[PDB]
Amino acid sequence: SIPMWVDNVQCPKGPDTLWQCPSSPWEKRLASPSEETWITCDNKIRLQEGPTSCSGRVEIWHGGSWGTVCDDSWDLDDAQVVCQQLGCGPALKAFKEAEFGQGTGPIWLNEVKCKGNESSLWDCPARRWGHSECGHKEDAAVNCTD
Amino acid sequence: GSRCAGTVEVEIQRLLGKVCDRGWGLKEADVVCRQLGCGSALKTSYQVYSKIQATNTWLFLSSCNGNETSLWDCKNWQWGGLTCDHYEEAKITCSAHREPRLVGGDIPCSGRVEVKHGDTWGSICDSDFSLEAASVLCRELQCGTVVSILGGAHFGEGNGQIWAEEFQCEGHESHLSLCPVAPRCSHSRDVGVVCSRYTEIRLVNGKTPCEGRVELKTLGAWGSLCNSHWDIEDAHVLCQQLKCGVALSTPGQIWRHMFHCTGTEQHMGDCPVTALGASLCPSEQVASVICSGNQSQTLSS
Amino acid sequence: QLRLVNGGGRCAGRVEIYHEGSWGTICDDSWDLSDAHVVCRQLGCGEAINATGSAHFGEGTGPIWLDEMKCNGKESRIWQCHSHGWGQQNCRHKEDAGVICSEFMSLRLTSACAGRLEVFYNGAWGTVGKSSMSETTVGVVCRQLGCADKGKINPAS
Numbered sequence: 001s002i003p004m005w006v007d008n009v010q011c012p013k014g015p016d017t018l019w020q021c022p023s024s025p026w027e028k029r030l031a032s033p034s035e036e037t038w039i040t041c042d043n044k045i046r047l048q049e050g051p052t053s054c055s056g057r058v059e060i061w062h063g064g065s066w067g068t069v070c071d072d073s074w075d076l077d078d079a080q081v082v083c084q085q086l087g088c089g090p091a092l093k094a095f096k097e098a099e100f101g102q103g104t105g106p107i108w109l110n111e112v113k114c115k116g117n118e119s120s121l122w123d124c125p126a127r128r129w130g131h132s133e134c135g136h137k138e139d140a141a142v143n144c145t146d
Numbered sequence: 147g148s149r150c151a152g153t154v155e156v157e158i159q160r161l162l163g164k165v166c167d168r169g170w171g172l173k174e175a176d177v178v179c180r181q182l183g184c185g186s187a188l189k190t191s192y193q194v195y196s197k198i199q200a201t202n203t204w205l206f207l208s209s210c211n212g213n214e215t216s217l218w219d220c221k222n223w224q225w226g227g228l229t230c231d232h233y234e235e236a237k238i239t240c241s242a243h244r245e246p247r248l249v250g251g252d253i254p255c256s257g258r259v260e261v262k263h264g265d266t267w268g269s270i271c272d273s274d275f276s277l278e279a280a281s282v283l284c285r286e287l288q289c290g291t292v293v294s295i296l297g298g299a300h301f302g303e304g305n306g307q308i309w310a311e312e313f314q315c316e317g318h319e320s321h322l323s324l325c326p327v328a329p330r331c332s333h334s335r336d337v338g339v340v341c342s343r344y345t346e347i348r349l350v351n352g353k354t355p356c357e358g359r360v361e362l363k364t365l366g367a368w369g370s371l372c373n374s375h376w377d378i379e380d381a382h383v384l385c386q387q388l389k390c391g392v393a394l395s396t397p398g399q400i401w402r403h404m405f406h407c408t409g410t411e412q413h414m415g416d417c418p419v420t421a422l423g424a425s426l427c428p429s430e431q432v433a434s435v436i437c438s439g440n441q442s443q444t445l446s447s
Numbered sequence: 448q449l450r451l452v453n454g455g456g457r458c459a460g461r462v463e464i465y466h467e468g469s470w471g472t473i474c475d476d477s478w479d480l481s482d483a484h485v486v487c488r489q490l491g492c493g494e495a496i497n498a499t500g501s502a503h504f505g506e507g508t509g510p511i512w513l514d515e516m517k518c519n520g521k522e523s524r525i526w527q528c529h530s531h532g533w534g535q536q537n538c539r540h541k542e543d544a545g546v547i548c549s550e551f552m553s554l555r556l557t558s559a560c561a562g563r564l565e566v567f568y569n570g571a572w573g574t575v576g577k578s579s580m581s582e583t584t585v586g587v588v589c590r591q592l593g594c595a596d597k598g599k600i601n602p603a604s
């Protein structure tokens with residue numbers, strides 16, 4: 001087990017780091033798993049409006065907004081990276097032309113030159129998080145193994 | 147494309163005309179903006195959206211001090227009688243051309259983006275606002291750097307007219323007016339931004355507005371920050387933020403925020419702050435600051 | 448233009464369409480025998496026997512600009528179908544489309560390259576007549592199969 005450091009953490013609106021959230025003082029005490037904190041966050045990469053879990057349009061999170069990746073040079077290598085980051089099987093198809101509907105929010109990624117072996121889509125060399133003229137009709141989509 | 151930008155046009159007894167830009171410094175542009183009620187002039191140019199008919203006559207300004215309440219009060223201005231041969235019209239773009247604001251946010255420097263198009267405020271669709279546009283927005287409102295852009299009407303939906311303009315900000319612009327914008331949504335997709343100056347720190351219980359006990363507001367409650375880690379560098383930044391110059395000495399509930407200012411920060415939002423796990427603090431041992439009160443006074447290394 | 452590459456003949460291999468100064472292959476998506484009848488009749492190879500795909504005839508290097516083929520079969524041009532667009536790749540060379548036509552012709556010897564002469568036409572294998580079989584024809588067969596320059600006629604075994 002691991003001793004508990006801090007408790008009663010109350011993050012206000014505006015800080016993006018836990019260090020700026022006021023709370024009870026640091027104390028070294030033994031804590032049972034009942035009062036320990038377990039958090040299951042949703043990864044930045046996700047697919048929406050798909051028949052299965054690992055199918056649908058590709059959406060990423062950056063700067064507090066759920067953006068969408070444009071289908072510029074969106075080949076199977078990019079889909080291989082996306083499916084691997086999602087944690088399911090290898091990609092089956094890399095759809096284009098907003099196959100699974102129009103995405104919401106802005107567009108962060110376009111012309112992603114993934115090599116098919118990147119651990120995450122953020123390691124792919126491309127113009128990232130803005131400076132994109134793509135519309136929502138050009139939203140990329142991914143179809144992975146069930 | 148707005149009432150505070152474009153080529154200036156002068157009408158005297160119902161006559162079309164403009165102003166020749168001879169000696170058209172920023173002072174005369176500021177005077178024009180002041181008489182027009184559009185803030186302060188920024189750039190002697192504009193993004194062309196409409197066309198103004200050419201006119202034979204011109205308005206010539208010899209010299210204006212800059213503090214004049216109107217162009218007509220400037221000394222020795224000549225209307226007609228000369229020709230704008232080698233010069234052009236006095237193009238201008240005042241600030242309120244794109245005057246933004248943040249509303250619907252509990253903390254100071256966050257809220258739904260609402261850019262005013264001269265007179266009418268309006269929301270912006272989340273797809274027509276990038277990181278560079280948000281960064282300029284936080285900079286213009288002296289709110290530091292941008293933390294996040296929250297789409298889908300995070301701060302609620304603002305009634306009004308949604309602008310279809312898309313800001314092509316480079317990122318280094320000092321105002322949204324200077325940004326090139328490309329005109330061409332729904333209120334459920336209103337864009338909101340969160341800047342980095344969320345501190346909301348003030349001085350309370352002082353004989354002078356530039357003096358008193360340090361109080362800070364987080365979690366929606368004003369509290370009395372104490373001097374466990376309130377060094378003189380922290381006090382220097384607080385006085386600088388409050389436009390009180392520099393600090394001199396440091397004599398609800400108690401917030402335990404630890405401010406790690408280096409002294410050169412212009413606001414508390416820029417200062418690295420650590421509040422997690424901070425130890426308790428004696429009630430009688432609280433933070434306070436006496437500022438110099440001279441805005442001209444500045445710190446030194 | 449139009450051509451077939453790496454199929455062992457003129458009427459088999461990956462379908463290649465030439466435009467904009469380059470040769471490209473089809474995505475194979477919805478690549479039915481009806482879509483193969485038009486490509487085979489364009490070359491004059493008659494009807495189509497197989498409509499292969501998934502790089503059955505190899506990995507085709509070159510941009511892909513033809514996907515989602517819905518040819519009805521009656522038409523006589525590959526580009527006249529319901530093409531998704533001139534450049535809508537959205538696919539990979541590992542899913543390259545290839546066809547086999549009726550007039551695709553192949554040869555082999557069955558019994559390495561000593562045995563009965565078999566010719567593959569119209570999707571079926573069959574022997575070749577021994578009448579008027581000169582030494583030049585046997586030499587052409589052996590050179591074609593790539594295992595000799597000449598040959599000899601043998602009785603049936």
Ligand SMILES: *[C@@H]1O[C@H](CO)[C@@H](O)[C@H](O)[C@H]1NC(C)=O
Pocket residue numbers: 050051055056092093143144
């Ligand atoms: C993903 O691909 C498989 C086979 O390639 C297909 O059966 C399935 O329908 C696809 N998923 C879609 C189109 O959502």
Ligand SMILES: *[C@@H]1O[C@H](CO)[C@@H](O)[C@H](O)[C@H]1NC(C)=O
Pocket residue numbers: 496497498499570
């Ligand atoms: C082609 O189709 C025929 C039946 O029409 C079949 O017997 C043959 O195995 C097929 N060949 C290939 C390579 O698909």
Ligand SMILES: [Ca+2]
Pocket residue numbers: 073074075077078111112113114
């Ligand atoms: Ca790619």
Ligand SMILES: [Ca+2]
Pocket residue numbers: 375376377380404405406407
């Ligand atoms: Ca300090």
Ligand SMILES: [Ca+2]
Pocket residue numbers: 474475476477542
């Ligand atoms: Ca396919």
Ligand SMILES: [Ca+2]
Pocket residue numbers: 474476514515537538
């Ligand atoms: Ca396809």
Ligand SMILES: [Ca+2]
Pocket residue numbers: 477478479481482516517518
């Ligand atoms: Ca078909």
